[PDB]
Design a binder for these strands. Structure first.
Ligand SMILES: C[C@H](CCC(=O)NCCC[N+](C)(C)C[C@H](O)CS(=O)(=O)O)[C@H]1CC[C@H]2[C@@H]3[C@H](O)C[C@@H]4C[C@H](O)CC[C@]4(C)[C@H]3C[C@H](O)[C@]12C
Ligand SMILES: [Mg+2]
Ligand SMILES: [Zn+2]
Ligand SMILES: [Zn+2]
Lengths: 50, 1336, 476
DNA sequence: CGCCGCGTCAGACTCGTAGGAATCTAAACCCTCCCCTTAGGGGAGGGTCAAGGC
DNA sequence: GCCTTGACCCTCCCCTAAGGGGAGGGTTTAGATTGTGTGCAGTCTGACGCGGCG
């Protein structure tokens, strides 16, 4: 499954869950720590915001 | 945009200024035409239009009319997005307490009023009255009245006094109280108090009242009179696909609040009986409580499922709250996912990405390059081209992915190598092709694993993927400087098979012109890969300069080693391949290439190693068959002999020679011995049983057995698993953990029968259940570690400190567990390292100890190096790059802006899934002996008697370094004169394990003191001893008198003269405790050293060490140094009094005497030595011995857990967490400072305050550093956002609201929550110029 | 004592509710008699003020010519057909007129009291009696608010002794004869208000109309109103004892409604409101027990509040009743046929068309929680599957921007006049589009010339020289 | 006042598809307000079609 | 070509006579009835705050 853009949730406007919903991958908390352990501040900022 | 986040209490006027109207009805929407109903919870007049730029009535329907509020429907013509921002309010008909400030412990309303929560809850529930003001009356303030007391004092004392119930009463109390007057009263009450419980009570209340005074908050705002209403698009009521509606639980809760509030207003209009109004007020209170926090007070309100409704507090807290599910991690666009397969052709920097995945992930890039190249006139034309998948969109796709990395991620992301960047190679499958060499970093196998792909969009993200995250930058581990992109399985088997030697292999003994000739002969079939041969090898070495000088010689090598030499880079020696290469040798070869030549030769070398190992594992045909599991031919007789032994032990048990316990232990021992015999026979028949002819004569060589070659190369398999294949499976454990006494005498080559298989499943399932249940514990520990250490970043380059820890090799007993070289490599020295030849600088003061300095320390005799540590860094809010040392992933000193705290937490928490969730001295080797902390005397039989409990024996080599370290109990008699040579196996120390002897002070004669006979002694005769002994028994054994009064064995001269000590005139007597056996009488002489009396005696561990948990019963340590005396006994708490010589004398403890004391009344103590024994508590280690002692203790006790499982973590990473646990300090004397005494502040704050106070000549504060566990240290941060997002969100938000806290967003989590660059890494420059263009 | 032991407000309510014991058949009767004596006392204290009786006789002469009916003026007599009321109204008018002239002062207390006791006979409808008592409350509260504005200004000046400011203020009622005695002490406070001695006049000289509009003394009015207050506090304390004694009846009825959307204490409180209405409406002279009448009002209040507030999306009472009727018809048809009926035959047993019943069946459904676990898991909920359908796709936003750019390009390739009227005719880079007359008047040109200009500019843009960029923004 | 057992509170893995929960329940009156019914009429507001006039 | 001019033309909204139909809202209802009513749970372990004994 892949996705560039798609549908978003109502309350929070983040991508939806599954490949049935054509959803995004969960960039969870441990992946955020992995990016913070590198100095990947811009990669992280575009994961979070954009 | 903004620089801080402030949190505070909301006043009623603040709540009414957020709102755009009052919600007056529980109507959501019309049932027929689903437009929102007026004044309801969904109301376009309050909350905004439901269509974009359109009123509700339809009169104003376009952007031509914007911002005009329709006069018919009242709706402002604007964007409908405002329904996510516009709050409303409910004007509550009665004051309702906020449940957070009442029921989140400790109660803020209770602490501020100094009322128990039991009385406040009784007043709130209209069960009791409280007197707001007493007046001309004997009633005190806040006195609780029952109803009959109220009706008595009301008619008896008129309406002079005022007393109410409900939250109107609590609100009148909170309004009527004067905070500054009560602060002064409580402070002068603290200056009148010595009781520390009441002093803690008072400092709690004082800092609450002071937080209220300093903040703009008023106490009475903890009682709600206006209630905010969340915007309706955040609690949406939306039509589902089948015409049904889906709603939030907040609409149910808000409707209940409105309904009970409107009914309360109705009842107050009707002037209902007050039992009905009190009931409606209680119902409105419990409805508002269920809205705010459902389930704190009483039972959770459930709606229409018997499932409890999700309240406002449940929206923001927990694993499924806003913070952890939506703010600390998100679902992202430009992300795909697929099964991973192997590509063994790939280079280390590239992955294989399916074309179907890449065509979707890179879709706006393809649209842009289609419109740019003129192949599409419009983004919709380009969209239709990409839908039709024309032949040109594949060329466009091949040029948009060209230098564009993608991040590949495998969950769980246990460390930072779980995300790595790769250049994509477009492949035709649906599966991602992962390079083999990175799988160990990902913990990935190709048996169904999936990986996520993420596309870096911006140029900065692309350059971070290329420069920080690319897999060619990730070849060293950050946990330990070892290679993590390392060959395994097939590669090490191919490289091992290639570099092995057979005895008479084809083409043996020829002389080759070089490695190219060896490859020609192997490929043309004229020589075997294992033919030992003589090859002219030219190898290059780096001289003193960076120059690469060649030497050519004929090496005695094999054909395969010469072939493998062709891929080795130039600066490496031929001895790196002139051996059989297992996993360790290949890992060390890659590490050697990295340290000598750098990263660019190493990534090429690792790729070449992978290709060559794959090729020659293919060439080998290395299969596994059933004839490879060679069972030893004598296994049957080993089992028959152990069966005969177990039969004779069984007959001995039938004949009563042994009881069941020693019988069972004998059976276990003779089966473990027989298992070791079968294992040794199997491995001996497996490891060399190639017998081979050299010119006719037979010879033994190492075996080319496939099972053995896989085990011996480190490819797969241990000796412990070959034992189960070809030996016997051995003894199994019950689910209790106790060993079944009949082992599996079978192996897997033979079958197991039904019973053997069943008792093997007993432990198979236990291991699988541990694996299934310990991932949650290791994830929770890693989360706590990250959240304690997330804010630690290398911010400075050198703090100029001179402190540090003295690194020594880890020696437990007679084994050197950790040498100095890997404890000190990559660390900056803290003092000049000297030779044993004194005063000559071997290593200067600020040297980073790279491998050459470590070899210099190793070729000299340096046994201790003092290094700089992060626990001793002087840097406020960070760490300097010199107290940290090397970046273990790079190999050079750490850079400023590195988030070393996340690296430390991930380095500790990644191996947590490899941990489990559920006498005399015999010196090993030769060397001198030296002892420490000895109380030593000379015995009458030519001995040394060490009458101390802090002594330790250390064995020095001719080098000069301690190699073994033991420590001996009290009164251990030495079989050795201390200070000269010993031998291997030579016993130095002998003692009694089970009983504690009393050892005299000086030579002399026995004398008695206070031992009144018959009342302190039972004189009992042991029938086969000849002389009767005398027992000093328990205190309940004898009558009043000697039961508590202590028998004192004096030593005097035969002429009656008391013998005096050399150096002091201290009276020489021995006070002995109860439960003692004495064999001595008065008159018999005793020299110094006679023993007169005998008083007889995984993953959760790491989580307990980092949480600083005090053990069940700890050791008892000496707080102050002095001499031991005893106070009030015979309570259960033995009263010990340590008496200093030059200090304030009385210091007492309450030691419960059901634990054996290890101190005597005549002997001194040092502060912190063990008085009683047990597991040491780290708070005690920190208080009594210091910061360096507690960090030494915690790193040693954690690395004992990790080294036991063969896990190698640098202790930089444990020192980082220990530093984050020592972040608070309790003030003991404020001086001329702004702190109280007994107040816990940040250590950096009080250190900066003292810097400023001693900068202005005044005296600063004095403190005692605290130790907090990783949960209490991460909840005590100066940032309420990170603490509220970690856990206990209600407590954090409650204390932050009543304190009026302000979060300056200085750590990593707070800038992640709010969508900013983190202050680490490539966002460190941005934050620096954000703070220097704000401080200017 | 159970105080402080539970959290349940249901247990707290039942606990404090059970401390009142039930009434006998005789207890209800004398509580109702206490209520009726309180209201009778209020009425006999009203009778002292004449204009209320004047308004009531106005109402009766309006009933004479039928501007209204006396069935809305009096519910009956105690010692409704319109002949006895003529007798009682005539004998009451003959009393009011014979009281009107007799003013003296001891003789004035015979006729007022006998008119009070003969006016006691009229048991009015609640509306008229409530109007009379509220009218008297407004009269006394405006008289009282100027009475304490007299002291409002005296506090506006200085320190306020009014312990003995009341000494001869009582009884004079015509002039400042009580006011002159305040300066007769000549303490400094007695200075201040006296230079406001003129500004006070229109307060106590507005008395100049009202003592001529009421006929009786200030404390006579104040004390018949305090007797009204005593009577209504007697009638209100007796209504409270009848509500408090019958809360078990409310719980008894409310336990049969417990799971229809409202919670048990919600039902109890709504039934308590119904019970208070029943206490207000009960008549003990009908010989029935209070339970018989009060059950009607308690059930009314509970069922009405279930129709009002049991649902998220509120259904009106008429459709709530249609749904209930449909449900019991479905129950009968499911029992008598062993099979759930279809809307066709469900519309033939009912009297209603089938398309009406189909929407009634589509109208009665309660919303699902978006915290509903999907898969009956606890990690994924229904709210995780619901999409924002109001979001514009980024390809649609990018298409909108590219179309704005393309029309900007083609409108730059026209005359300035034609591009202006074509950006003005449509809303292009303006906030509103315009009509032919507005574009024309801004140009001081006709409507038809602007129509010609924009039609010609459109024909220019139709040519493929200017159209191939824009034709790409269209579909099949 | 200091300590001990008891009450209470807070934490505890991410991919595909299935996938929710299912009980219980006035009637007779009255009112206002809104839309509906023919076969078109009338008007406001806004466009459109050929005539020419310069 | 730019500009008027008079005649046409369109949709959209409101109106017709005598109520019909329905939605959505109020109100009372008089034999006597007077205290709900469910579960569910095989967590452990820290850790904190408090009645109660000493
Ligand atoms: C949005 C979501 C796609 C993912 C679709 C696909 C399956 C749908 C649910 C099922 O149909 C069962 C049930 C039917 C009810 O009628 C309404 C609720 C339920 C839970 C539906 C909700 C929603 O419609 C779902 C989750
Ligand atoms: Mg796998
Ligand atoms: Zn409008
Ligand atoms: Zn430092």
């Amino acid at each position: 499954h892949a996705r560039s853009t798609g549908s978003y949730s109502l309350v929070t406007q983040q991508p939806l869950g599954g490949k049935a919903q054509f959803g995004g991958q969960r960039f969870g908390e441990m992946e955020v720590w992995a990016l913070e352990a590198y100095g990947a501040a811009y990669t992280l900022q575009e994961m979070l915001t954009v | 945009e903004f620089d801080a986040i402030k949190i505070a209490l909301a006043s009623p006027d603040m709540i009414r200024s957020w709102s755009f109207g009052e919600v007056k009805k529980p109507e959501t929407i019309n049932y027929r035409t689903f437009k929102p109903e007026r004044d309801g919870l969904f109301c376009a007049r309050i909350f905004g239009p439901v269509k974009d730029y359109e009123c509700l009535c339809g009169k104003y329907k376009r952007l031509k009319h914007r911002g005009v509020i329709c006069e018919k429907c009242g709706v402002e013509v604007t964007q409908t997005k405002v329904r996510r921002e516009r709050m409303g309010h409910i004007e509550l008909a009665s004051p309702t307490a906020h449940i957070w400030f009442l029921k989140s412990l400790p109660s803020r309303i209770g602490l501020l009023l100094d009322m128990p929560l039991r009385d406040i809850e009784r007043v709130l529930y209209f069960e009791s009255y409280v007197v707001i003001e007493g007046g001309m009356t004997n009633l005190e303030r806040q006195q609780i009245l029952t109803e009959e007391q109220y009706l008595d004092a009301l008619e008896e004392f008129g309406d002079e006094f005022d007393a109410k119930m409900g939250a109107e009463a609590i609100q009148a109390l909170l309004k009527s109280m004067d905070l500054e007057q009560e602060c002064e009263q409580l402070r002068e009450e603290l200056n009148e108090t010595n009781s520390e419980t009441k002093r803690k009570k008072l400092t709690k209340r004082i800092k609450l009242l002071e937080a209220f005074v300093q903040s703009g908050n008023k106490p009475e705002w903890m009682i709600l009179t206006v209630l905010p209403v969340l915007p309706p698009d955040l609690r949406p009521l939306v039509p589902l696909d089948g015409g049904r509606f889906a709603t939030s639980d907040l609409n149910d809760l808000y409707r209940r609040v409105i309904n009970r509030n409107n009914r309360l207003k109705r009842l107050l209009d009707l002037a209902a009986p007050d039992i009905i109004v009190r009931n409606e007020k209680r119902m409105l209170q419990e409805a508002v409580d269920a809205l705010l926090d459902n389930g704190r007070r009483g039972r959770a309100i459930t709606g229409s499922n018997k499932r409890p409704l999700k309240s406002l507090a449940d929206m923001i807290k927990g694993k499924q709250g806003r913070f952890r599910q939506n703010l600390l991690g998100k679902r992202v666009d430009y992300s795909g996912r697929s099964v991973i397969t192997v590509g063994p052709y790939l280079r280390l920097h590239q992955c294989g990405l399916p074309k179907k995945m890449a065509l979707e992930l890179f879709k706006p890039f393809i649209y842009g390059k289609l419109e740019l190249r003129g192949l599409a006139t419009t983004i919709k034309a380009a969209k239709k081209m990409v839908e039709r998948e024309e032949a040109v969109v594949w060329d466009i796709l091949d040029e948009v992915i060209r230098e564009h990395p993608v991040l590949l991620n495998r969950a769980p992301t246990l460390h930072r190598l779980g995300i790595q960047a790769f250049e994509p190679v477009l492949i035709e499958g649906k599966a991602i092709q992962l390079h083999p060499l990175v799988c160990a970093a990902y913990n990935a196998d190709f048996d169904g694993d999936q990986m996520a792909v993420h596309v870096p969009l911006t140029l900065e993200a692309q350059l971070e993927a290329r420069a920080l995250m690319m897999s060619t930058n990730n070849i060293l581990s950050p946990a330990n400087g070892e290679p993590i992109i390392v060959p395994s399985q097939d590669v090490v088997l191919g490289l091992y098979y290639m570099t092995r030697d057979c005895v008479n292999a084809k083409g043996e003994g020829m002389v080759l012109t070089g490695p190219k000739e060896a490859e020609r002969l192997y490929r043309s079939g004229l020589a075997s890969l294992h033919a030992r041969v003589k090859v002219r090898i030219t190898e290059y070495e780096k001289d003193a300069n960076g120059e690469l000088v060649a030497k050519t010689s004929l090496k005695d090598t094999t054909v395969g080693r010469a072939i493998l030499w062709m891929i080795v880079p130039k600066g490496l020696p031929y001895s790196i391949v002139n051996q059989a290469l297992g996993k360790k040798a290949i890992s060390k070869m890659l590490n050697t290439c990295y340290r000598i030549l750098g990263l660019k030769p190493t990534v090429i070398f690792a790729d070449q190693i992978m290709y060559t190992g794959f090729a020659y594992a293919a060439r080998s045909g290395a299969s596994v068959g059933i004839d490879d599991m060679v069972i030893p031919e004598k296994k049957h007789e080993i089992i028959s002999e152990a069966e005969a032994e177990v039969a004779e032990i069984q007959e001995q048990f039938q004949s009563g020679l042994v009881t069941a316990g020693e019988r069972y232990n004998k059976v276990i021992d003779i089966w473990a011995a027989a298992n070791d015999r079968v294992s040794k026979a199997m491995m001996d028949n497996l490891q060399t049983e190639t017998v081979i002819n050299r010119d006719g004569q037979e010879e033994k060589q190492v075996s080319f057995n496939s099972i053995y070659m896989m085990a011996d190369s480190g490819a797969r398999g241990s000796a412990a698993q070959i034992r189960q294949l070809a030996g016997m499976r051995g003894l199994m454990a019950k689910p209790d953990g106790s060993i079944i006494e009949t082992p599996i005498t079978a192996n897997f080559r033979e079958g197991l029968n039904v019973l053997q298989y069943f008792i093997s499943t007993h432990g198979a399932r236990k291991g699988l259940a541990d694996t299934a249940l310990k991932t949650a514990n290791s994830g929770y520990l890693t989360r706590r570690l990250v959240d304690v250490a997330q804010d630690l970043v290398v911010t400075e380059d050198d703090c100029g400190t001179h402190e540090g820890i003295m690194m020594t090799p880890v020696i437990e007993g007679g084994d050197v567990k950790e040498p100095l070289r890997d404890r000190v490599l990559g660390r900056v020295t803290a003092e000049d390292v000297l030779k044993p030849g004194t005063a000559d600088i071997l290593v200067p003061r600020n040297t980073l100890l790279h491998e050459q300095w470590c070899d210099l320390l190793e070729e000299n005799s340096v046994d201790a190096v003092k290094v700089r540590s992060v626990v001793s860094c002087d840097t406020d809010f960070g760490v300097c790059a010199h107290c940290y040392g090397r970046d273990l992933a790079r190999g050079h000193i750490i850079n400023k802006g590195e988030a070393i705290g996340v690296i430390a937490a991930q380095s500790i928490g990644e191996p947590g899934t490899q941990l489990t969730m559920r006498s005399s001295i015999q010196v090993k080797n030769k060397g001198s002996i030296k002892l420490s902390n000895v109380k030593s005397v000379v015995n009458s039989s030519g001995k040394l008697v060490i009458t101390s409990r802090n002594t330790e024996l250390k064995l020095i080599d001719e080098f000069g370094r301690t190699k073994e370290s033991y420590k001996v109990p009290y009164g251990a008699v030495l079989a050795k004169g201390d200070g000269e040579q010993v031998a291997g196996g030579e016993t130095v120390a002998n003692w009694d394990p089970h009983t504690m002897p009393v050892i005299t002070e000086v030579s002399g004669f026995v004398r008695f003191t206070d031992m009144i006979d018959g009342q302190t002694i039972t004189r009992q005769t042991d029938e086969l001893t000849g002389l009767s002994s005398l027992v000093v028994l328990d205190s309940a054994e004898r009558t009043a008198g000697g039961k508590d009064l202590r028998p004192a064995l004096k030593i005097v001269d035969a002429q009656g003269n008391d013998v005096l000590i050399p150096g002091t005139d201290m009276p020489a007597q021995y006070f002995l405790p109860g439960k003692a056996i004495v064999q001595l009488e008065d008159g018999v002489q005793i020299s110094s050293g006679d023993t007169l009396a005998r008083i007889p005696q995984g993953l959760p561990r790491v989580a307990d060490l980092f949480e600083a948990r005090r053990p069940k019963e700890p050791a008892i340590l000496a707080e102050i140094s002095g001499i031991v005396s005893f106070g009030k006994e015979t309570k259960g708490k033995r009263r010990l009094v340590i008496t200093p010589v030059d200090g304030s004398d009385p210091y007492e403890e309450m030691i419960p005497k059901w634990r054996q004391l290890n101190v005597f009344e005549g002997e001194r103590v040092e502060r912190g030595d063990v008085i009683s024994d047990g597991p040491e508590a780290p708070h005690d280690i920190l208080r009594l011995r210091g910061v360096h002692a507690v960090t030494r203790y915690i790193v040693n006790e954690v690395q004992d857990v990790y080294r036991l499982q063969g896990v190698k973590i640098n202790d930089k990473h444990i020192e980082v967490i220990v530093r984050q646990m020592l972040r608070k300090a309790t003030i003991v004397n404020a001086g001329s400072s702004d702190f109280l005494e007994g107040e816990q502040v940040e250590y950096s704050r009080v250190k900066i305050a003292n810097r400023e106070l001693e900068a202005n000549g005044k005296v600063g504060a004095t403190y005692s550093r605290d130790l907090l566990g990783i949960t209490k240290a991460s909840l005590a941060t100066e940032s309420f956002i990170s603490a509220a997002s970690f856990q206990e969100t209600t407590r954090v938000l409650t204390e932050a609201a009543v304190a009026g806290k302000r979060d300056e967003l200085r750590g990593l989590k707070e800038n992640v929550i709010v969508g900013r660059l983190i202050p680490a890494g490539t966002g460190y420059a941005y934050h620096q110029d954000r703070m220097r263009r704000r401080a200017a | 004592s159970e105080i402080g032991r539970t959290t349940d407000p249901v247990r707290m309510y039942m606990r404090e509710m059970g401390t009142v014991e039930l009434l006998t058949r005789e207890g209800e009767i004398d509580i109702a008699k206490r209520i009726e004596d309180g209201i009778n006392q209020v009425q006999c204290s009203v009778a002292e003020y004449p204009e209320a009786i004047t308004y009531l006789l106005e109402q009766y002469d309006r009933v004479e010519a039928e501007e209204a009916r006396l069935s809305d003026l009096i519910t009956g007599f105690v010692d409704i057909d319109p002949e006895l009321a003529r007798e009682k109204f005539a004998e009451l008018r003959a009393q009011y007129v014979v009281t009107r002239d007799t003013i003296k002062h001891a003789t004035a207390q015979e006729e007022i009291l006998k008119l009070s006791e003969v006016f006691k006979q009229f048991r009015l409808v609640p509306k008229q009696f409530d109007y009379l008592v509220n009218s008297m409350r407004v009269m006394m509260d405006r008289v009282r608010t100027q009475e304490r504005l007299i002291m409002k200004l005296c506090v506006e000046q200085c320190k306020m002794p009014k312990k003995n400011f009341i000494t001869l203020f009582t009884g004079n009622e015509t002039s400042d004869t009580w006011f002159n005695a305040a300066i007769a002490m000549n303490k400094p406070w007695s200075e201040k208000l006296h230079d406001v001695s003129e500004e006070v006049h229109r307060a106590l000289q507005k008395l100049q109309q009202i003592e001529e509009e009421t006929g009786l003394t200030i404390e006579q009015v104040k004390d018949i109103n305090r007797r009204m207050s005593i009577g209504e506090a007697k009638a209100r304390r007796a209504k409270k004892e009848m509500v408090e004694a019958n809360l078990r009846l409310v719980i008894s009825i409310a336990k049969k409604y417990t799971n229809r959307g409202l919670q048990f204490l919600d039902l109890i409180q709504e039934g308590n409101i119904g019970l208070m209405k029943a206490v207000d409406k009960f008549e003990y002279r009908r010989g029935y027990k209070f339970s018989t009448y009060a059950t009607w009002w308690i059930r009314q209040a509970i069922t009405r509040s279930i129709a009002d507030q049991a649902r998220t999306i509120r259904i009106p009472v008429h459709m709530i009743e249609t749904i209930n009727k449909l449900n019991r018809i479905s129950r009968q048809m499911l029992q008598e046929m062993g099979r759930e009926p279809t809307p066709e035959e469900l519309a033939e047993r009912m009297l209603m068309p089938e398309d009406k019943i189909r929407k009634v069946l589509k109208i009665a459904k309660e919303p699902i929680s978006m915290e509903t676990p999907i898969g009956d898991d606890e990690d994924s909920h229904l709210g995780d599957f619901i999409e924002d359908t109001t979001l514009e796709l980024p390809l649609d936003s990018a298409t909108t921007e590219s179309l704005r750019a393309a029309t900007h390009d083609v409108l730059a390739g026209l005359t300035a006049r034609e591009a202006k009227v074509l950006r003005m005719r449509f809303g292009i880079d303006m906030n509103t589009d315009y009509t032919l007359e507005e574009v024309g008047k801004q140009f001081d040109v006709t409507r038809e010339r602007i129509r010609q200009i924009e039609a010609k500019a459109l024909r220019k843009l139709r040519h493929p020289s200017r159209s191939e960029v824009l034709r790409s923004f269209l579909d099949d």
